[PDB]
Design a protein around this ligand. Sequence first.
Ligand SMILES: [Zn+2]
Ligand SMILES: [Zn+2]
Ligand SMILES: [Zn+2]
Ligand SMILES: [Zn+2]
Ligand SMILES: [Zn+2]
Ligand SMILES: [Zn+2]
Ligand SMILES: [Zn+2]
Ligand SMILES: [Zn+2]
Ligand SMILES: [Zn+2]
Ligand SMILES: [Zn+2]
Ligand SMILES: [Zn+2]
Ligand SMILES: [Zn+2]
Lengths: 288, 287, 287, 288, 286, 285
Amino acid sequence: RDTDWSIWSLAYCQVDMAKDFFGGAGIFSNSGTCINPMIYTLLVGGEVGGKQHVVLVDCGFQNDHWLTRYAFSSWEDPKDVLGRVGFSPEDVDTILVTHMHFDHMGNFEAFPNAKLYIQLDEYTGWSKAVCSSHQHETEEEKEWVFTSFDPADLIRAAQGISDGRVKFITGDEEILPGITARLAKDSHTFGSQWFEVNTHNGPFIAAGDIVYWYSNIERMWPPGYHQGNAFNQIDVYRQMRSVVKNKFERIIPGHDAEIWNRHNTWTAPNGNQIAELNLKDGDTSRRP
Amino acid sequence: RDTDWSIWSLAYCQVDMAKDFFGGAGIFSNSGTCINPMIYTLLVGGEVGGKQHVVLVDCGFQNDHWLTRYAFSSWEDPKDVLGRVGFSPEDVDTILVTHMHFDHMGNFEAFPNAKLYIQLDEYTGWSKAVCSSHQHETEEEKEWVFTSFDPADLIRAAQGISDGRVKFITGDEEILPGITARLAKDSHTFGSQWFEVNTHNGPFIAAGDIVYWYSNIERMWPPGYHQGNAFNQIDVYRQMRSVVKNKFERIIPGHDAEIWNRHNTWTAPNGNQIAELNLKDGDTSRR
Amino acid sequence: DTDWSIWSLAYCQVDMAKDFFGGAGIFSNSGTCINPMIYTLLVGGEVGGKQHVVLVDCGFQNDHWLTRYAFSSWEDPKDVLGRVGFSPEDVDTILVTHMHFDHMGNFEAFPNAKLYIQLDEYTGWSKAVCSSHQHETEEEKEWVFTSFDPADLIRAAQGISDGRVKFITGDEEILPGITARLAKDSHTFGSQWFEVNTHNGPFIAAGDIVYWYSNIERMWPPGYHQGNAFNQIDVYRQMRSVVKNKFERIIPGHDAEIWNRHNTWTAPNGNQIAELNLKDGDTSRRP
Amino acid sequence: RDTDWSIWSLAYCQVDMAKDFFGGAGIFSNSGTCINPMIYTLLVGGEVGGKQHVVLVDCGFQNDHWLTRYAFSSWEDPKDVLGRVGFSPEDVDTILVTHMHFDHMGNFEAFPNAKLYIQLDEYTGWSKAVCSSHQHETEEEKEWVFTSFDPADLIRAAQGISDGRVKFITGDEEILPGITARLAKDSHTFGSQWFEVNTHNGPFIAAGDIVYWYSNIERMWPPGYHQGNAFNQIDVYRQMRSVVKNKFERIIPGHDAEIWNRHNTWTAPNGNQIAELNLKDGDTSRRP
Amino acid sequence: DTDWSIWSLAYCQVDMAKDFFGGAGIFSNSGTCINPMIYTLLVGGEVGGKQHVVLVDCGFQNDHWLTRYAFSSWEDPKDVLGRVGFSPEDVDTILVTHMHFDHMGNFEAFPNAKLYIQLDEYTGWSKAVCSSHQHETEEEKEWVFTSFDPADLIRAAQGISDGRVKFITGDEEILPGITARLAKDSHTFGSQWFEVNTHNGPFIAAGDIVYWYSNIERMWPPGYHQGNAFNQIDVYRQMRSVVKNKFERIIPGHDAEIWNRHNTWTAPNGNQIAELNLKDGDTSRR
Amino acid sequence: DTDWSIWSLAYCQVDMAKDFFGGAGIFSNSGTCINPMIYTLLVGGEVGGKQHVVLVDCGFQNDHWLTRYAFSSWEDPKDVLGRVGFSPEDVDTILVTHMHFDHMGNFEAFPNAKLYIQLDEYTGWSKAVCSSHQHETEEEKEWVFTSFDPADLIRAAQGISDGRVKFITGDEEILPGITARLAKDSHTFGSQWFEVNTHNGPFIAAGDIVYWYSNIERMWPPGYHQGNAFNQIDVYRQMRSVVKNKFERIIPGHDAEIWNRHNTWTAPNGNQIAELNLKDGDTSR
Ligand SMILES: [Zn+2]
Ligand SMILES: [Zn+2]
Ligand SMILES: [Zn+2]
Ligand SMILES: [Zn+2]
Ligand SMILES: [Zn+2]
Ligand SMILES: [Zn+2]
Ligand SMILES: [Zn+2]
Ligand SMILES: [Zn+2]
Ligand SMILES: [Zn+2]
Ligand SMILES: [Zn+2]
Ligand SMILES: [Zn+2]
Ligand SMILES: [Zn+2]
């Protein structure tokens, strides 16, 4: 089947963060701070002459308590972030979840028509991890387990499973035409997955937090904060490099402001960026 | 290492059901119906000279929509059922869940001080199965998986996990002094577990639905309705027989009125039975 | 590439409680009914090349099994296969869905045929028979042997020594256009079903994984089986996907409804004969 | 200690055989032939003061075509072999099968009251191997598979399974009081097992054909003919040496005339040997 | 029936950023500090008698590794062992927690010592070193080799050939009262920790699974490591359980706090020395 | 679309008991015979692509091993490869069937070649070497080291760090038309054989899983091996299936019968040269 997809990376928030957090405890230690985007990626396309899908890789978090747990700024609603590219949250039929951290699957219920795809190992891993954490007597002992995980997202996932809106992927699978989910077990998280997007202009990768920063995969240096196996990430980087033949601009990192320096980018009134990574044959640009 | 436990099996409801359902196709086919008890079991004890635990194996379902999906009668609140043996739901500190069928974990939020114990395979099995079933285009194609399973219990399970009130068992484990949980993978359900209870009068077994009826384990004949592997149940029957040295009255089946005929039993006003299976050193009977 | 013509032939009939085949809930206490005992003949293979004459299963012999259960109208392979223009000597390969007596019993009646069975089926029954002899009484073994003849374990071993039995381990395209599919712990330890590719699309020989169309149409496994009910659910879905929900393309094991869904002749006696596919020039063997 | 066993190794036949077969292709190539005993081992005992079991480790082959496929001589019936130590074949309640080669299980039906214990992997291994062999067009291509295996023993085993005479062991198991079966997967054969026998004078090992000759385990040099994994045999030798704390005479090899030099031995009229390896407490010697 | 004398000796020091050892987030952009390089001497065994001289880890040689990091105060083993009454050649056994340069580099300075290391540790590094060489530039290889010397792969092989090294595969009580604990994919592919059963309770040589006491106390894996963050969390719980949450009975890899909570006395260059347990019938040391 | 020229080059000869190579049963007490020591030259790859020059195995050096067995006629890689128009410097790839001394001992004579080994072979020998040193005497270690030199373990680790050795894990097409097939616990822990696809059909470099044509023709594994005899049986079946029972298409490890099945000529000292295949557009010798 021939597939083609338009791809936009949309900032919906910003975080000021220690560099070693994203870039590595070695190379980026004691290197000050910087602003990094909170991003989700819109994909529109599919089989040519077939159903057109409106897909989000990840969907941001909500305007809730998480805004106080880190140095966030410039948060924007899905109505506004997607409106600037000519869509609405109602139009989104699928959310592909790289991992169940709060900033990639929180707020999925703002897309009432979307089905959620999660790796089974991600869901089961977090169920066990959350349950195990309650053997510690204080919350200080639980802090690391919950640094990026909202137990309420466990409840929402179960609610979606029973509702029929959450679907499990187990391993690798072409879930939409030209989008292949790749399980990276115990990489960034228990069941992090990345996505291979095949377009007429070649492959693109939505890496999730497996690749926080381009420097992670270019320097082969896993981040200072992650909740998996650093050597597994090494293995995944090599898989990703092979898919895109080291055309590093084709990989979408999770939280790297460097992405705006590498693609046709314009900014919204508040500053949040929009990137036009690719346009399928016959589509028009969204720059004002 | 010296454990001792008092054991009461208490009926909270009754169901009229075709016999082959519980007893088996072929041998009990076209045998009409009979009343069968809906049961949970109270265990009080632990290490002699130690903390006396108050534990439930299973806790029944709520008087909700489930009362109409089967021929139930005489449903009773846990306050009424445990009161007859001298306890209240607030006393229950542990609920041992044999499996996640609605009638064994439905009403657990009625015991606000209790921790829930479930096999990881039971929880993960149902998460996968519920999700897989929503790939069917019609609701009729989904009936069989949900005949005994309430997706609302999946949600309550997830809520208790994050609350810290639900704990996973993975395999065999002595979770309380003298009570060891036994994983029976893919027997009655994905992660059914049974419980071995060690007292001064020897072992007792809480079997759950692996053994619906004594005849399941006496005739080695699995039921006409189950959601796991029939030959796995046979193997579990053999383990149970070995633990109990073939003294069958020492096994507590899930839904067999025959239990009231094998132990010291009396009736409540509405009819629900209270079987006293064992009394630990120093306890007086509650007839 | 490949094409095959297909006939399903009865060789006996069985009167059985409906809950046996259809489910303990929905078909309980529904009386009894007549069900065909069937094996399926396939003739063909690759288009320009060796024509194979194949049986899926081969029925049982007229021995003590006629007094077991309640059979009637039993017929010899010489009679059943002659009506379609063949003799028992023509069959070069018999595909065994599982080692229950009525699907592999009479295999020595086809002297030129190689028998194909899943390694897990043979190993499972070897273990199960041996394990059952841990029970001291014959009554405790009844369920293991409800459908299994220990003499067929010996005949199977005799055939292994003869080179007449071949093991399949998992999925395999055995003959041209016929893929065996292992369904581990489905009806039995190593049940397998067969995907048959013709010019008119695919056909499925389901064995007893699907006793009745109602099993797979309602997604409701039978009341009697010796495997895992949820595994059967998974297989039902695999089969539906292969056949694009064109259910008449699935050959159930023991369902009179197949005579209502296909060109079906009838024999001098009651046992039926049903055409399912005729690949170009296979003159219909319909009178 | 609460268990005790008397132990006799009894030769029932003799075989003239090339030395490299039993001792190894390195040291014993082109080294001629020698006479080697065909042996099964009688164990009498159990719980001290409780049931006196009568046990055979292996039971030899029958007087059939096998007598011509090798240089056999002096085959003797179980009535005569066991008669010399004061027992009859009807006394044997248990036959422990090291492996299903013809000379270790061929004759089990001459012991009408005995249950056979066989490793599940041994039975399934031979079932597969026999069935696979019939893909070869000539009987010569099957010859190695059948050098020590009789397909008729497959049928007899299936018959014993159906009768309730055959019991499967899967892995390690204390089968009788003081006798533990040890699975040695893929050693001499698919499911070879050896037996540790606890006596008041310490442990004895019935090695089956894992140890043909003392030299295999003393020199750590597996034989030239076997149907398993040579390095697996190396690993089992180490387990055996450790159990007997390097008392090599406590190990009963399958086919070594050297055993008559290491134990109190006398001979029958035809030359077949009797070795009294151990006499449990209270037991009297059987030497004439 | 089993007793052990236990000494933790600092053979060197490093000035390192805090998030490296303590964790990103709670120690991000928090500056740096001096941290010790230690190996742990245990001598004793079955109270019956046979006394073994065992080292947990054995430092790194004084070579190019001294310039790769803010090292100082590197001392010889004969120097450091002498201050507690021993000579390298006395060591019977070197228990290797993992194959990073600074726990395995100088094992040849102990000609009598058998080396015990996990099969997965050795096998994982063989795999990794080989995998890295499909990277064309040296910058891409940097992280794999931050703590690993390819020359230690060649020594290990030479040790295998010589009979100096033996592979553990799983848990195994390697010497009377010392249980080796496989922690697959913790700090490294096959890191392991050791559970020393002394008459005065239990002791844990943590290796680099626990860089700092605060990794286990704050349940917070470090910012640099080369295995599985959640696996470390689960080993933290296995350790906490073995010592009943008495954290001092765990010896971290590179925490100067260990000097603070155990009898310590500086040496000439300052490299500390702490005695954690002297087996009754054993003589102390300054 | 692949094509390869194939030469089997004897670089040495060994006088050995027949049962060693042929079997403890059939060839017992059968005396000895001369057997070739062989490595195979492969030149080709994808048609229209980078033509590779590859060695399957590379022999051992003229060192202590020349005295550990009845060897004769040892020749250098410079001489043996010189006769077919190449030098050791041309070989960029050596595919190693197993780590026995006579198949990897001399790989450093090929300074530009990458070495490919099964991971299970390397870890297998690493473990076995360590386990062997638990025995207190050297006679108890002899069988483990009959064909294995611990110096090759050290040379292997050095190449690992140097970047010259690569691990294969299971089956893999390493070069165009060459598939490595792991045969776990066959001749050794991680023995591998190679399927070579040419325009004239498939050829197999069997290593020592097949010492002699009679192993696979008689389905009778050898009297000396360090793996699992029934695994070799199953591997024999895979090989026979690939070549559709054309046994001359299988390259055995040590069988002089090979010179009788192909265009063969001899060197001055006696060592044989076998031209098994010439890819489209090639001239003989
Ligand atoms: Zn994240
Ligand atoms: Zn993120
Ligand atoms: Zn139930
Ligand atoms: Zn129930
Ligand atoms: Zn059936
Ligand atoms: Zn049937
Ligand atoms: Zn044998
Ligand atoms: Zn033998
Ligand atoms: Zn370190
Ligand atoms: Zn380290
Ligand atoms: Zn070799
Ligand atoms: Zn060789």
